[PDB]
Paper text:
Nucleocytoplasmic transport proceeds through NE-embedded nuclear pore complexes. With a molecular mass of around 120 MDa and an outer diameter of ~120 nm in higher eukaryotes, NPCs are among the cells’ largest protein complexes. Nanobodies (Nbs) are the isolated variable domains of heavy chain-only IgGs. Using a selection strategy against conserved epitopes, we obtained anti-Nup93, Nup98, and Nup155 nanobodies that block Nup–Nup interfaces and arrest NPC assembly.
To map the functional epitope of xhNup93-Nb4i, we solved its structure in complex with the α-solenoid domain of xNup93 (residues 168–820) and xNup93-Nb2t by X-ray crystallography and cryo-EM. The tracking nanobody xNup93-Nb2t binds to a C-terminal region of the Xenopus Nup93 α-solenoid, it is frog-specific and did not inhibit NPC assembly. The presented approach relies on a high species specificity of the used tracking nanobodies, which can indeed be explained by the corresponding nanobody-target structures. Similarly, our newly solved cryo-EM structure shows that xNup93-Nb2t fits well into a pocket at the C-terminus of Xenopus Nup93, but clashes with the backbone of human Nup93 at the same protein region.
Author numbering: 2 to 122
Amino acid sequence: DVQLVESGGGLVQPGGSLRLSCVASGFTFSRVGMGWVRQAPGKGLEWVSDINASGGTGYADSVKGRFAISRDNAKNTLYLQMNRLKPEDTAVYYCAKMMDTAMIEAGIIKPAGQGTQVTVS
């Protein structure tokens, strides 16, 4: 099977915390740069965070210092630790290969997975 499968969303209060996961299947995970994007109501898809195969990371300006991306290669799993959550973070979050993120933002392709919903209210 070839899939990206997100879980871990939920409904938290402002200031709260969630950890999202994505389990990847169908390819050698450790050598691929992975990331997260999100889609807020009425908006397009937008980058959240990247982690390259070497463990270098990047974050959208609006989440820096609050979110932390990590990966467990032995479990084919990507994580996004969300702390200090804000109402503006409400969105469906999706996992992607890093090389797919710009095409997803542009609407050229869609996320592979069904995503997971985060509501901050």
